[PDB]
Point group: C3
Chain length 346, copies 3
């Protein structure tokens, strides 16, 4: 970030990046120019000796389509909050679900990883609307690395009808009232463990419009491990979900088990190779689908950091999914992808 | 605002807010997450000892819907102008209609009020496209507190056809050529009186597409009073309109009588309780409607200012409208609403 | 540009403008309020004493329509690059096609000139998606004033089908693989000559959907001249195209000859009168059209610069086109336009 303002107890940072990015793939919905930029503002005000006020907004602006194209920009984050010394912080708005406090440990690939085809707004697993989040860092300032979070999310319902809210959306991004919690900590120097749990009510449209997934509650359980020392980064996460993992355009998996593992090495001159394996296995799917792989790929790439403001990267998604009636009907890509990027960050 | 640049006669103020907001209501089109942010710039250049140039842009970015939702950001203001000593200022672009010079005195509620009796792009009552505005403060420097404005707005017509302009829109936001004037007198520190007038040609689509309201011209007459001293804020405004006030989706009221009154108290410790009453009465409505209430509510709330950069509020709109064929057919909300907000300001 | 950050080798410049603009014309698709603003950022990081990293984003935000109107903002530019001593620079993203390195010399009118009705995304003639651009200044430092560029653009295909890419668009803005080069030389102080060439594959939809133009490839050849000294600015460019110039909504011209010439004078007190002639003539058009003028007008205007941050202008497009079957079927405006603008710049 770049501090652009600091007067009379208020500071503002401007941050973002411009990513000149191209994908090469046989999947025509992914192949081609993917250039985009992100811009954001982070503010913080000293209210009193212990109390601070803050705000953050992060905007994504696509630059890979024409000036006559639609829906090219969107808000990723927008929240306001208060932090009281070591007692913790509280913020509300569009923010990350606390499941990401642990699953973010494997979200370190040069380009790929993280969100799936539909994106965020997947209960408390990624960026979400209307989350109230309490966080406590370093256990009231006493235990370095021991962090916890408690989160609540209000219902974001249908566009119209009895299940509507003002900010309605399609079944794949709807949610009822929900809660989540996360706890991360260091076992040893450079070694961390983390746990996250979430439970949300599902909506009537989620239980009637798509063909797959039925249940009143969406739940996730995650465990994660991280090694970050001696220029080596190792991370793994395992998540078991119930009615919460999308099965592409078909609905939700009644049960799913997601596993991700990554190994990276940082050379002092800037080069950072990366190798990872990601899989999401769906269980008990309806319509005779039974058990199906939803995601399965090995990732190999590298980022070269010129400095903190400039980098270049390559990433190879080695797609291990077979083409079958599930991947075709769900619209899940089975093709490999190569990404090439040049990034200026502020 | 936050001044981020001030060099070689030019200065730029970056301003905005991030409002973590939630509405509680039985009306499902209102209920839920309402988080949004505003961001703008105010620029000013000293051309010479007597001449200053200026520009302002204000953007609204909703953050309560998904990253794949449409139409989540829009420009509220965008205008450039010149100010010449005591001779006044002139600006053109998207800016407030001069009726708001007086009705803004009651637009001070913690959350509600504002675009209720006179919504956006509603002739010269609120923000408007293509307004050319001449303003004069302290009557050419000769009468302290005496301000006046003269404004002209060119036609903003239909999307296609004989009534079109490049920037066409639907009947509810159209206008023909029009003008407005306002005069406000700050007679003494904290005591003010104001008058505003507007007259616009109506369009052919406004006299055909909506179910209600017919006439060649839209006219408004406003009177206002404001007391702001001794930690107390009192204000009232009365506006009588002809073919200018919207009757929801039904069209325009042939005549309307709009009234707003507010009383607030500012405690030194930061709390600002507020009580208000707002009403808009439609008269001589066609199709058997006769006289109907378009808007009617008591507002009770409070804002707590932590400092100049952070605040929190609660607002309770006690909706006095009843569900009837007019409110149903016009799409006017008759339910109560509670708003809870946490705002970071810059 | 306004430098809002300069610390540790990283520099950020915020730039843009707010243009309070109104057009007066008998053409209802152009007549009326045209207010808009531009905002951008130019960032540069010193990686080492010879290598620099950079990025630029330019955003256009229309402010002439309502807050409920769609598609009012878009990215004009977004690219990241590396610049290394005399070896040159390389950038990738949304950037100008290298034909603009020479045609930009006539794109200096108060308001008119530049892009036509469809706008940019016209092979390498204007702003384009997915362009990889190599530039070299002063021929590796060996020939002062001799610059060149080499550019590649990957396919930007259809929305769906065999010829699709992720960022698909309509035939008017598609392209296959393309290459461009430019070369400019300052013969003497203030006198330059330039040449540019582009060759792009045309897509199957371009060769099947539109009424006019058929060919495997789009090709352009440009020569230009500029005099910029003694407060005088004269420039001209001639471009010959094959299957590259849009014939309005009808398609592309099998052959076209474009010519633009401009003359301006800068008075020390701020006034800058301007006169220009612009023509685009389609040759070998199918369906009995034969030779037709696609664009033909004289431009007379003036800009008054109060200083570097504030200006006002009047521009008069004297449209020499006649209403015929070609202009009617192609949707080409044949009407005169007068533009009046008041601009604040940062
Ligand atoms: C900011 C922390 C708030 C935690 C309150 C959780 C209330 C439980 O809601 C869960 C409903 O899901 C079933
Ligand atoms: C705020 C204080 C509480 C902090 C959170 C406590 C721990 C949250 O529980 C997380 C549950 O994680 C279980 C991990 O299991 C991974 C796979 O589980 C298989 C399903 O049983
Ligand atoms: C650190 C990640 C190393 C990559 C491991 C690849 C393992 C391949 O698994 C294929 C599973 O097929 C069943
Ligand atoms: C500009 C010359 C340097 C560009 C990098 C070399 C290109 C080869 O890339 C191989 C990357 O392999 C990454 C897997 O580890
Ligand atoms: C506009 C003329 C009517 C005068 C009303 C004045 C009311 C309050 O005056 C404030 C004087 O206090 C000193
Ligand atoms: C045409 C209007 O004629 C009505 C005259 O009534 C005068 C009311 O003016 C109100 C000014 O405040
Ligand atoms: C079908 C509805 C009735 C149409 C009658 C048209 C008469 C137009 O009169 C315009 C002038 O009257 C203005 C009256 O304003 C009185 C209130 O002024 C408020 C200022 O504080
Ligand atoms: C020059 C216009 C004078 C203002 C008169 C109209 C103001 C409307 O409010 C009057 C009623 O005051 C109610 C106070 O409670
Ligand atoms: C301070 C005493 C002066 C009172 C001013 C009287 C103004 C008379 O206005 C009549 C028009 O009323 C408009 C509102 O009508 C509502 C019914
Ligand atoms: C002379 C100036 C007097 C100022 C009047 C102050 C008005 C007092 O307002 C009380 C504020 O209390 C806010 C209560 O909001 C409750 C919302 O709760 C929702 C209930 O469902
Ligand atoms: C101060 C703004 C925080 C708003 C919290 C909203 C909680 C959602 O409740 C839904 C029932
Ligand atoms: C010394 C003045 C040069 C700039 C004057 C521009 C106006 C004269 O242009 C005449 C028409 O030329 C059309 C453009 O053709 C350029 C051909 O390129 C040849 C480069 O030597
Ligand atoms: C003030 C009206 C001037 C009209 C434009 C004339 C342009 C003359 O420029 C000639 C430069 O040589
Ligand atoms: C003062 C020199 C500017 C040149 C004006 C050209 C006007 C062209 O008129 C064509 C009308 O038909
Ligand atoms: C170097 C001076 C260029 C000025 C542009 C010419 C303006 C008048 O052109 C009239 C052309 O008429 C063609 C028919
Ligand atoms: C050199 C400046 C030339 O500007 C003249 C513009 O006037 C042309 C005549 O247009 C009349 C219609 O325009 C009405 C609004 O100005
Ligand atoms: Li289930
Ligand atoms: Li595959
Ligand atoms: Li009427
Ligand atoms: Li009610
Ligand atoms: Li051709
Ligand atoms: Li014409």
């Amino acid at each position: 970030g770049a501090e652009i303002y600091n007067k009379d107890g208020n500071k503002l940072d401007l941050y973002g990046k411009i990513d000149g990015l191209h994908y090469f793939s046989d999947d025509k919905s992914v192949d081609g120019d993917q250039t985009y930029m992100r811009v954001g503002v982070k503010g913080e005000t000293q209210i009193n000796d212990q109390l601070t006020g803050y705000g953050q907004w992060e905007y994504n602006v696509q630059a890979n389509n024409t000036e006559s194209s639609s829906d090219q920009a969107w808000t990723r984050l927008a929240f306001a909050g208060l932090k009281f010394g070591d007692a913790g912080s509280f913020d509300y708005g569009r923010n990350y679900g606390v499941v990401y406090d642990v699953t973010s440990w494997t979200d370190v690939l040069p380009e790929f990883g993280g969100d799936d085809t539909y994106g965020s707004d997947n209960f408390l697993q990624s960026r979400a609307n209307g989350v109230a989040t309490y966080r406590n860092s370093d256990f009231f300032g006493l235990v370095d690395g021991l962090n916890f979070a408690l989160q609540y999310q209000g219902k974001n319902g249908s566009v119209s009808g009895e299940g509507a809210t003002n900010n309605g959306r399609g079944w794949s991004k709807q949610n009822g009232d929900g809660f989540g919690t996360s706890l991360t900590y260091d076992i040893w120097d450079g070694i961390s463990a983390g746990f996250a749990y979430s439970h949300s009510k599902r909506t009537d449209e989620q239980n009637s419009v798509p063909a797959l997934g039925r249940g009143d509650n969406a739940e996730t359980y995650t465990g994660g491990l991280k090694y970050d020392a001696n220029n080596i980064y190792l991370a793994s996460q395992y998540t078991q979900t119930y009615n919460a993992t999308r099965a592409g355009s078909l609905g939700f998996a009644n049960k799913a088990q997601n596993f991700e593992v990554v190994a990276q090495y940082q050379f002092d001159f800037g080069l950072r190779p990366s190798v990872a394996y990601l899989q999401s296995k769906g269980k008990d799917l309806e319509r005779g689908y039974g058990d199906q792989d939803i995601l399965k790929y090995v990732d190999v790439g590298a980022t070269y950091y010129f400095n903190k403001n400039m980098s270049t990267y390559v990433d190879y998604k080695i797609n291990l999914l077979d083409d079958n009636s599930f991947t075709r009907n769900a619209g899940i890509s089975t093709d490999d992808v190569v990404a090439l990027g040049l990034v200026y960050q502020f």
